Specification:
Blueprint: E1 3-6, H1 11-22, E2 26-35, E3 42-44, E4 47-58, E5 63-68, H2 83-94, E6 103-105, H3 109-120, E7 127-129, H4 131-138, H5 147-154, H6 184-209, H7 212-232, E8 234-236, H8 238-263, H9 272-281, H10 292-298, H11 303-328, E9 330-332, E10 337-340, E11 343-345, E12 354-356, E13 367-371, E14 374-378, E15 391-397, H12 400-409, H13 412-419, H14 424-433, H15 442-456, H16 461-468, H17 472-485, H18 487-503, E16 505-507, E17 513-515, H19 524-560, H20 569-572, E18 581-586, E19 590-595, H21 600-612, E20 623-628, E21 635-636
Parallel strand pairs: 1-5, 2-6, 6-7
Antiparallel strand pairs: 2-4, 3-4, 4-5, 8-10, 9-10, 11-12, 13-14, 15-19, 15-20, 16-17, 18-19, 20-21
Helix pairs in contact: 3-7, 4-6, 5-6, 7-19, 8-11, 10-11, 12-13, 12-18, 12-19, 14-15, 16-17, 19-21
The structure holds the ligand Cc1cccc(N(C)C(=O)[C@@H]2[C@H](O)CCN2c2nc(C)cc(C(F)(F)F)c2C#N)c1, 2'-3'-dideoxyguanosine-5'-triphosphate (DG3) and magnesium ion.
The chain binds a DNA duplex (16 and 13 nucleotides) through α11, β12, α15, α16 and α19.
Subcellular location: Nucleus; Chromosome
Region (DNA polymerase activity): 239-633
Binding site for Mg(2+): 396-397, 589
Length: 639
DNA sequence: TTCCAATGACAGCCGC
DNA sequence: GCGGCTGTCATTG
């Protein structure tokens, strides 16, 4: 039967609860947030509307222990239990002793870790288990889990507990979601019971699939590193952004006025229909699609397609990068600067990490605008700055996916190239554009990068032709030459497709499985798509495993040499200059840290050493470190 | 429908 | 009319 024990209603019940809690090796917690220093709970950073009023603990059955964090105002509070006394006993039960294996189960661990630190001044110090991450680990292509989907799949007999609790079908924790008519006490108590029991079932399934070691040693520690990143945020300068915006907007104005004179009338740059009417009906250019690929061919024949492409590039930087950054910026009064607080997203097909609100991974590379034949550099990344005195440190793996592919295919030709061979992208660009390596621009090297990974991951002659600007036949010859020169790779492609067809899945270097039932499909497209996913998932997923291990191992090292706070949040939630390195961004094969001037040499050594040691392959994991006053102005730094 | 992975703005359409 | 859905366009790795 569902029972909620209000432990703070009676001194005697409270101590019995505290004694039992202190001996538990496993329990769930769920935070109780409701809509409105206050007597009735702890304000949440970023929401003037909602309070943490308590939390619920579960360690078996359908008993929730509700632990109130209200000074005044379920039976009422025993007044001998001061809030200060409760906060003591709370911090005591949520922090590890020496040689004590202790696991806390939290739905949306990251959001809960942050609220406990910033709102209640409590830093969790135990092993963490998030059922959302366990779901992902069992099927990475599953829809993002909700409490409702977890209970549906893993605890279906308890679905009645969720009847009339419609917010259980949203992504946000039932306890944290104060946009309900149900009390935080009831919501957190139900969640605590559903999550504890759900996690027992998820742990049995992880053990059956042999993913429990991955879950405890890589994925949950990776979530802890991402919690520190989300507490840290990334520094942002508005002055740099505005000055770039003004140059961009001037170019957009000139492009529009010239486009409209060539067209003969106004047209919307955002309507494919309008652009198609102008290009194909009203100018009779040869084709109706208005894609990048189409306009890229046609720019050789008339100026308007090129103007369209530049309009979309610059409009993208203004409306999808500047507008959201200058809206999501937040004053940090301790560091004395604006920062952006993006949200990590780990539920991906291959185990990459991405970001939302906003997605800082998508901030444009440097690009050039010409006006009156004078070039202006647009560096959106230059707006992302360290705290005063600090530096940005970036460490990137050199061709990690190629090194992993070499290791798994034992391809002797690819190993030679990686051992000595110059930049492969520059080599391809040179051969293609009839030049020696040195002339390649950034844009052209990116085109060659797309060609090289494209071919490796099963790009066809029609598409390679559009990209290289050559006939399908010439592209098909290029594909054959690749396959002939690197026969190891081609054997590994056929051996991976054969093994996928048999098993219904592929596995990464750490044992994670992706299910590709399209592999058996009779439809030629769906079959070929699955075969391409099979090959790409093993290499891209393996790379994502290595970067996670690197991230986790760097964080351990930083915290040993840590005579200082493990995140900027740990100073906010505390209430003496900044020392150490702060994880600020992940870019798939690249880690960014914000580092105090004094510590950049030591942090650069730790980061490089730990990234190069993450795993042992047939080939060396090469790491380049760069350093600078912004993400946009990073310079090579020999470590 | 023929590189893979990702987020997100933005016209435009359709059952409610 | 209105929110959901669905391409389509962009960008990054
Ligand atoms: C101009 C052009 C276009 C398209 C293809 C190729 N071919 C068949 C290659 O061989 C090219 C260059 O001749 C040497 C690098 N290179 C590589 N290409 C691929 C696809 C792949 C690789 C790699 F996997 F080995 F890295 C290399 C290299 N090295 C060439
Ligand atoms: N399938 C595919 N994977 C890509 C593509 N671009 C990048 N990736 C994957 C493979 C490389 C990895 C990291 O991308 P980078 O741009 O850093 O590539 P890199 O090979 O490391 O180049 P660089 O030397 O500039 O760091 O992401 C692409 O167009 N297709
Ligand atoms: Mg790289």
């Amino acid at each position: 039967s569902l029972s909620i024990i209000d432990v703070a209603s009676d001194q005697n019940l409270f101590q019995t609860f505290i004694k039992e809690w202190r001996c538990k090796k496993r329990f769930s917690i769920s935070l109780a947030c409701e809509k409105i220093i206050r007597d009735d709970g702890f304000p949440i950073k970023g929401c003037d509307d909602t309070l943490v009023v308590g939390l619920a603990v579960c360690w078996g059955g359908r008993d929730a222990y509700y632990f109130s964090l209200q000074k005044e105002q379920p039976p009422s509070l025993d007044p001998s239990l001061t809030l200060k006394d409760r906060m003591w006993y709370l911090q005591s039960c949520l922090r590890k002793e020496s040689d004590k294996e202790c696991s806390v189960v939290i739905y949306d661990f990251i959001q809960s870790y942050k609220i406990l630190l910033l709102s209640c001044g409590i830093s969790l110090e135990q092993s963490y288990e998030d059922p959302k991450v366990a779901c992902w680990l069992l099927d990475p292509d599953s829809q993002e889990p909700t409490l409702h989907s977890i209970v549906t799949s893993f605890l279906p007999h308890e679905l009645p507990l969720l009847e009339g609790m419609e917010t259980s079908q949203g992504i946000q924790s039932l306890g944290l979601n104060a946009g309900s008519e149900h009390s935080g006490r009831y919501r957190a108590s139900v969640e605590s019971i559903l999550i504890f029991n759900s996690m027992n079932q998820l742990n049995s399934l992880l053990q059956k699939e042999n993913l429990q070691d991955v879950f405890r040693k890589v994925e949950m520690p990776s979530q802890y590193c991402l919690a520190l990143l989300e507490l840290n945020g990334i520094g942002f300068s508005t002055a740099e952004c505005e000055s770039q915006k003004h140059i961009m907007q001037a170019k957009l104005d000139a492009i529009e006025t010239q486009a409209y004179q060539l067209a003969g009338h106004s047209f919307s740059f955002t309507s494919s229909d309008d652009i198609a009417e102008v290009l194909f009906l009203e100018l009779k250019l040869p084709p109706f699609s208005t894609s990048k690929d189409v306009l890229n061919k046609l720019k050789a024949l008339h100026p308007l397609p090129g103007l369209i492409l530049e309009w979309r590039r610059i409009t993208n930087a203004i409306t999808k990068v500047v507008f959201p950054l200058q809206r999501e910026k937040c004053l940090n009064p301790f560091l004395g600067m604006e920062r952006i607080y993006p949200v990590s997203q780990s539920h991906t097909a291959t185990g990459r990490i991405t970001f939302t609100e906003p997605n800082i991974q998508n901030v444009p590379r440097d690009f050039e605008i010409k006006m009156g034949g004078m070039p202006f550099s647009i560096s959106m990344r230059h707006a992302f700055v360290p705290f005063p005195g600090g530096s940005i440190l970036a460490a990137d793996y050199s061709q990690l996916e190629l090194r992993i592919l070499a290791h798994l295919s034992h391809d002797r030709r690819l190993i030679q190239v990686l051992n000595t061979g110059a930049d492969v992208f520059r080599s391809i660009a040179a051969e293609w554009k009839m030049i020696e390596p040195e002339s390649v621009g950034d844009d052209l090297r990116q085109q060659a990068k797309q060609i090289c990974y494209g071919i490796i991951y099963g790009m066809g002659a029609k598409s390679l032709g559009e990209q290289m600007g050559i006939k399908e036949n010439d592209a098909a010859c290029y594909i054959d030459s690749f396959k002939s020169r690197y026969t190891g790779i081609n054997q590994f492609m056929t051996e991976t497709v054969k093994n996928c067809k048999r098993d219904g899945f592929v596995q990464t270097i750490l044992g994670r499985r992706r299910y590709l039932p399209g592999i058996k499909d009779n439809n030629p497209y769906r079959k070929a798509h699955a075969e391409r996913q099979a090959i790409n998932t093993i290499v891209q997923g393996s790379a994502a495993d290595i970067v996670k291990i690197a991230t986790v191992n760097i964080q351990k090292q930083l915290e040993t040499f840590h005579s200082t706070f493990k995140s900027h949040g740990h100073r906010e939630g505390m209430l003496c200059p900044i020392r150490g390195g702060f994880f600020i961004l992940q870019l798939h094969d690249e880690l960014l840290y914000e580092v105090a001037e004094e510590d950049v040499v030591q942090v650069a050594q730790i980061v490089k050493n730990e990234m190069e040691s993450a795993v042992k392959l047939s080939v060396k994991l090469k790491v380049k470190v760069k350093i600078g006053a912004s993400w946009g102005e990073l310079k090579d730094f020999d470590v």
